[PDB]
């Protein structure tokens, strides 16, 4: 018992409804991140694609500003609201300060956010996980991580959703500063982390890359294929 | 108050000051702006033997149920605007009641109205009818204060019509005598003259309510 | 059974048993019937005050809503009467807005909105009534019915209340398209004779018409007239 | 089940039981389908106010209009999908005020989605029991086709169709749908063959069908209801065809 | 600052309506045969303008048919009554012919909204003394299209051109003048 | 304190006093007035659009950009008493095309083939309907906006800085000459 | 402000309760505008979320203005307006969380 309200606590100090949360972004589809020296890299698995589906309204990747972008595992619908709150906090801070504004400004506005739900009887929490990352003023990159409680870390590589486990595992030990050298090797590297676990070949791969001094970039079909067969010779090879 | 609070109804005061800084600045470059329209023509009524006698000059004399009727002077649209809402009011209360309303009714009612605007709507009423109890004059001013009244005159010619009924009025009189009283005080003011007659012969009091045509 | 108390508590098969309740206790009231002819619609429903100690001019079940509206009702009184104010009310605030009379759709749509809202709450009730309203807009008539949950449809004839499966049956047999309003009235009083459990007089029953002229309610001779004519 | 009595509470592996209830509340619906084709889209229904005594008023009973390039269809609670067309009718009128440019279509169905998802979440409510259906026209992308689900979820389609028997229409479409090589009159005629597959009548009759066609013309939008005339003449045409196939063989 | 002048006059199963222009719009189509005309302060003029197209389509959306002028002379005055304490500068005037019936209607409304129906001719602007003795002059009952337009061009022109709308049962007809 | 300009077939010309402002990749917003109020105004505009941007994935046009500043303006106006600020805005569409917006500090909004601010106003806008024509190129518009200041400086008056110009077209907003 | 009106009409109804209670206290005693304000707040404590327009039939019962028509019910449809903020800032905002 205890777990059927969720301001209760367990006789050991435990509550169980945020918990049960957590549940749904660990049937969410994969996603991984990467920080880089002069690059970071996103990348999600793509799940069920059907025949008659247009890809431009499912997408898990979105730009928050100039110089962040996210992605997100769990519940679609929940992952709007949060996005949506956090492009007109970013504009509001903006207009507050001249400067633009940093990234772990906003993952703690979003945390925040998420912990201000997880305080009463009368709503519920939201059942998403994000991956935050982007590029500061002075050229720093940075990488985060939010949890359905309103907790937040900093990273240098992670995964969230299924699989979570053996990706974050083949990273431990294929993370190196040698693999981080260029950007090719970092999206090599994201390419085979997301490999692990996603089948059907590279067709289910989407990935996002974004640079110093520039905008986000959603990799073409042609260009994952591409990298997926460079990859596959130098296994070969 | 706040972008995230619920919206509500009723009269607007945006434009307050941007007008009141227009007026004077037009003012004192010398343009001129839109006014509203207004009448301040004669009216008149008399309380005769067994009903009410109500005169105007050219309609100007309202409708507000089957045995009451108003006239007005002022600015027209409040004066439209006021019937037409204690009219509606009026109608809901006979529905829900079933019988005819009161003259009483209505005089409370539109001085309420009137007072809660502290004036700034310009409307003076006058106001008969014919009750269970009796025929009923009232005469309304536009900051919510009554008479009840034998007769009442209102507008421009009011002086010569006041002192026409002051010359010529008696107690207990019949309805053509009381139309030719109404029409020469009217006449004694200044177009044609308009009257509205109201009989307790023509009125039952018995059967069940039925909403007019 | 442990979501048979609950308003805003779906079924594992997605239903909503509280307002089938509440239609079972719209099922439960007195008969009532509707009619609509070539050039009017006729409301007939069946007394509630059946003894002589009941003052005639005191309560009605047929009551106008504008001069050319007005309905009839089929379950619990108190919860007609405050429907009826508002529906009046409503009628009031279109006319004063748009300086025309309302139509009966529009009418309608309003009430049915009203009534929703009482179904997605919690700490209310339903309302256990449903209701017939007649009208008369741009020379046709109109007929429409109105369910505890919101919804309305428009029918050319309709039985609701108690035994009205039969009276619909009945009702499809005896029902003529080009049809005058005293013919139309012969069949009402004949669907209502079908299923009322006692002798008829024109003491317990009310008749309501409309036509050009307007909503009009009858008074006890024309009924007395009706039923010695049929 | 002790975690399905409100729609604030989670399961031990993370399911939310009376969403899940409430999207099984749309399958006793009437079918509705949509299909989207190279220079229009369409929108075919099923009647179910089907009665001798029932009486014919207002253009259709399950397709509406939201504003001049825009319509839809709803499959569900009637008294929910009136305030749902209510909502989205006020939110097209605020955006043409603000903007002076009429609203996108997937920017009307977010607006609405959130609405919608927002029921879901805080206690005390009941979720709305609807799904819809879009069709629209806009300068950014062209013609588009949406749908919508009672937890506030969307999606856009080539061909979809929610209600009863949705996954045998859904099945059927996929397996005899081309991509990219379509028209109005191929579109209406798989639009009569999936529903006469579909519906559980052993003839279909044109009384119980209706079909909404949008299309552009001189820079203008036309949303059309189709005739019974018409509807006949289909489903004549669509039954001596497969007379025709089935005697060559 | 100058304001304005707007006309309109009734023919024979015809209407037109008339506004001034120098060498902003004043005239705002609200239907297939129905338009409206304002004078005053420009700023007023375009709210009052956008916030009559809001009612108008969620009343043509709601109630599922074409709105009558009369209809939309109580919309208008309804407007224009609230905010009655600080009001707008405005002075609409309603020309168009019925939708089913096909009949003339003219129209003319104050700063708050008090409506005033005519016959034959309307005038709004702040030379309204001015320019109705000559409306008064020059009108005669039953005018084809082609005498109306003649005679409003006429009664603007004597009191810089002028814009014309000529409505009929089944053609619009704009024409664009100068002195 | 002065704004003027031009549009032509496939381009707009604008010229400013040293005020301009960047609002998306093919919009500029020209505002002179007391300082400390053109400066928020034009800042609440800018990330008003970014925001917009952000949530969409595509730009605002210049019409519903001047549509959405104009009824900024006029809420701001209302609350504030002593504001006063005048503005204009070029752009330019893959549909329509270029676009010259004016706008006055009543909160009025015109679309106008050339405009001009600031206190040389009357003589140059005369002068502009005189010598412009809808096929005006580039050069030539630079030549009367010349001819424009030449004449203007000669009552006595004098120009400070030396006028700075900009061009928008499909390529995006360039820096010329101080000319 | 503005206006000596905007006050006055902006608190109306909050005025009127104050003289009523005033008036029932001196004539009966405390338990009447008790029982009166507690059947106000359970009436009013249900109602639709605040981005969608209520009807408010009980609690206009138990005021007693279900038979009567003010300037707020013709003037400025609050259903039809013209503008709406986002919902759950709105839900936010009520519970004071802002």
Redesign the interface.
């Known amino acids: 018992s205890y777990d059927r309200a969720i301001t209760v606590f367990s006789p050991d100090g435990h509550l169980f409804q945020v918990e049960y949360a957590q549940e749904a972004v660990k049937k969410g589809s994969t996603a991984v991140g990467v920080r880089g020296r002069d690059i970071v890299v996103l990348g999600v698995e793509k799940k069920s694609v059907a025949k008659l589906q247009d890809e431009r309204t499912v997408r898990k990747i979105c730009a928050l500003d100039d110089n962040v972008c996210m992605a997100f595992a769990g519940l679609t619908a929940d992952a709007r609201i949060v996005i949506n709150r956090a492009r007109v906090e970013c504009q509001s801070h903006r207009l507050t300060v001249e400067d633009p504004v940093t990234v772990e400004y906003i993952t703690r506005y979003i945390a925040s956010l998420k912990q201000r739900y997880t305080q009463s009887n009368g709503r519920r929490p939201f059942g998403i996980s994000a991956l935050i990352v982007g590029f500061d003023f002075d050229g720093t990159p940075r990488l985060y991580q939010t949890d359905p409680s309103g907790t937040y870390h900093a990273w240098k590589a992670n995964a969230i959703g299924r699989g979570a486990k053996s990706v974050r595992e083949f990273l431990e030990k294929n993370y190196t500063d040698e693999a981080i050298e260029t950007d090719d090797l970092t999206i090599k590297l994201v390419i085979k982390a997301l490999l692990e676990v996603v089948q059907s070949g590279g067709k289910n791969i989407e990935l996002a890359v974004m640079r110093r001094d520039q905008s986000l970039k959603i990799l073409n079909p042609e260009e994952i294929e591409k990298y997926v067969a460079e990859i596959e010779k130098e296994k070969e090879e | 108050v706040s972008v995230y609070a619920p919206p509500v109804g009723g009269f607007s005061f945006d434009n307050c000051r941007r007008n009141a800084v227009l007026e004077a600045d037009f003012a004192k470059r010398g343009y001129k702006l839109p006014k509203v329209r207004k009448t301040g023509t004669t009216i008149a009524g008399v309380v005769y033997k067994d009903g009410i006698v109500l005169g105007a000059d050219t309609s100007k004399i309202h409708f507000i149920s089957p045995n009451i009727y108003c006239c007005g002077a002022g600015t027209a649209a409040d004066t439209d605007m006021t019937t037409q809402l204690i009219s509606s009011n009026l109608e809901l209360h006979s529905l829900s009641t079933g019988r005819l309303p009161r003259v009483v009714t209505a005089n409370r009612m539109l001085k309420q109205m009137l007072f809660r605007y502290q004036g700034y709507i310009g409307a003076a009423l006058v106001l008969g009818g014919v009750d269970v109890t009796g025929p009923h004059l009232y005469s309304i001013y536009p900051h919510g204060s009554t008479d009840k009244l034998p007769y009442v005159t209102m507008g421009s010619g009011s002086l010569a019509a006041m002192a026409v009924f002051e010359d010529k009025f008696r107690p207990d009189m019949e309805e053509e005598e009381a139309k030719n009283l109404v029409s020469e005080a009217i006449a004694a003011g200044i177009s044609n003259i308009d009257l509205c007659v109201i009989s307790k012969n023509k009125l039952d009091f018995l059967r069940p309510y039925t909403v007019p045509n | 059974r442990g979501y048979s108390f609950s308003l805003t508590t779906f079924s594992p098969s997605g239903k909503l048993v509280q307002i089938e309740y509440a239609l079972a206790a719209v099922a439960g009231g007195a008969p009532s019937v509707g009619i609509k002819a070539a050039n009017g619609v006729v409301l007939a429903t069946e007394k509630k005050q059946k003894s002589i100690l009941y003052d005639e001019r005191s309560v009605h079940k047929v009551e106008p809503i504008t001069k050319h509206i007005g309905l009839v009702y089929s379950g619990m009184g108190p919860d007609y009467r405050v429907l009826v104010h508002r529906a009046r009310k409503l009628a009031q605030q279109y006319y004063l807005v748009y300086q025309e009379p309302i139509p009966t759709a529009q009418l309608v749509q309003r009430v049915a909105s009203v009534m929703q809202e009482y179904t997605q709450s919690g700490g209310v009730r339903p309302f256990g009534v449903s209701l017939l309203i007649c009208g008369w807009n741009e020379g046709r008539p109109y007929l429409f019915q109105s369910d505890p949950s919101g919804a309305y449809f428009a029918w050319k004839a309709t039985a609701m209340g108690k035994n009205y499966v039969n009276g619909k049956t009945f009702l499809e047999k005896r029902y003529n398209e080009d049809l005058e309003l005293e013919d139309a009235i012969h069949t009402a009083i004949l669907t209502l004779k079908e299923s009322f459990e006692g002798q008829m007089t024109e003491d317990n029953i009310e008749v309501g018409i409309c036509n050009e002229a307007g909503f009009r309610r009858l008074t006890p001779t024309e009924v007395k007239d009706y039923l010695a004519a049929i | 089940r002790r975690y399905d009595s409100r729609t604030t509470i989670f399961s031990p592996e993370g399911r939310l039981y009376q969403v899940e209830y409430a999207m099984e509340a749309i399958g006793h619906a009437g079918t509705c389908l949509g299909i989207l084709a190279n220079d229009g889209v369409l929108l075919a229904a099923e009647r179910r106010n089907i009665h001798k005594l029932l009486d014919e008023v207002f253009f259709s009973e399950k397709i509406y209009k939201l504003n001049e390039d825009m319509a839809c269809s709803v499959a569900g609670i009637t008294s929910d999908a009136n305030v749902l067309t209510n909502e989205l009718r006020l939110i097209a009128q605020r955006y043409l005020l603000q903007y002076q440019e009429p609203i996108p279509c997937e920017q009307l169905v977010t607006a609405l989605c959130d609405i919608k998802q927002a029921y879901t979440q805080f206690g005390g409510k009941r979720p709305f029991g609807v799904s819809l259906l879009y069709i629209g026209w806009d300068k950014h992308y062209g013609f588009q086709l949406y749908q919508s689900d009672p937890s506030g979820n969307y999606g856009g389609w080539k061909a979809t169709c929610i209600g009863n028997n949705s996954a045998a229409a859904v099945s059927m479409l996929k397996q005899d749908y081309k991509e990219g090589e379509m028209t109005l009159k191929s579109a209406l005629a798989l639009a009569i063959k999936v529903l006469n597959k579909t519906m559980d009548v052993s003839k279909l009759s044109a009384e119980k069908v209706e079909i909404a066609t949008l299309t552009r013309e001189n820079g203008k939008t036309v949303i059309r209801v189709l005739k019974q005339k018409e509807v006949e003449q289909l489903i004549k045409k669509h039954e001596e065809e497969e007379a025709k196939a089935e005697r060559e063989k | 600052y100058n304001g304005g002048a707007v006309m309109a006059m009734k023919g024979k199963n015809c209407v037109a309506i008339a506004a001034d222009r120098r060498f902003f719009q004043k005239i705002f189509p609200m239907g297939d045969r129905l338009y409206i005309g304002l004078a005053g302060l420009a700023t007023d003029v375009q709210t009052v303008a956008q916030r009559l197209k809001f009612r108008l389509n969620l009343y043509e959306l709601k109630e599922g048919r074409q709105i009558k002028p009369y209809t939309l002379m109580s919309m208008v005055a309804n407007l224009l009554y609230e905010k009655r304490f600080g009001p707008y500068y405005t002075e609409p005037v309603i020309a168009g012919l019925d939708p089913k019936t096909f009949k003339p209607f003219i129209c003319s409304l104050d700063l708050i909204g008090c409506p005033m129906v005519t016959d034959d001719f309307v005038v709004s602007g702040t030379c309204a003394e001015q320019m109705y003795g000559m409306c008064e002059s020059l009108w005669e009952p039953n005018m084809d299209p082609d005498h109306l337009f003649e005679t409003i061009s006429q009664a603007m022109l004597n009191a810089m051109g002028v814009i014309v709308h000529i409505i009929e049962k089944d053609k619009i007809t704009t024409r664009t003048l100068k002195a | 304190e002065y704004l003027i300009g031009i549009q032509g077939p496939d381009y707009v010309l604008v010229a400013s006093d040293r005020k301009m402002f960047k609002m998306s990749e093919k919009i500029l917003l020209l505002c002179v007035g007391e300082a400390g109020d053109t400066v928020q105004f034009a800042?609440?505009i800018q990330?008003?659009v970014?925001?917009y941007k952000?949530?969409?994935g595509?730009e605002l046009?210049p019409?519903?950009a001047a549509?959405?500043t104009?009824?900024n303006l006029?809420d701001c106006?209302?609350s504030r008493?002593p504001y006063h600020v005048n503005l204009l805005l070029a752009g330019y569409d893959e549909?329509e095309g270029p676009a010259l917006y004016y706008m006055?500090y009543?909160?009025?909004?015109?679309k106008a083939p050339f405009a001009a601010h600031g206190y040389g106003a009357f003589l140059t806008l005369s002068i502009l309907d005189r010598y412009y024509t809808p096929t005006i190129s580039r050069e030539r518009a630079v030549e009367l906006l010349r001819k424009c200041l030449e004449e203007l400086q000669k009552r006595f008056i004098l120009n400070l800085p030396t006028f700075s110009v900009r061009i928008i077209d499909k390529n995006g907003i360039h820096d010329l000459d101080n000319i | 402000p503005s206006h000596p009106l905007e006050l006055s009409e902006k608190n109306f109804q909050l005025n009127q309760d104050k003289m009523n209670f005033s008036t029932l206290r001196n004539i009966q005693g405390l338990f009447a505008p008790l029982k009166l304000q507690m059947e106000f707040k359970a009436v009013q404590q249900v109602q639709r979320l605040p981005f969608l327009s209520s009807s408010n039939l009980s609690l206009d019962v138990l005021r007693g203005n279900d038979e009567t028509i003010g300037f707020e019910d013709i003037l400025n449809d609050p259903s039809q307006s013209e503008v709406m903020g986002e919902p759950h800032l709105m839900v936010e905002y009520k519970l004071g969380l802002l």
């Open positions: 800042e609440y990330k008003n970014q925001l952000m949530r969409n595509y046009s019409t519903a549509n959405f104009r009824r006029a106006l209302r008493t549909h006055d009543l909160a009025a909004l015109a």
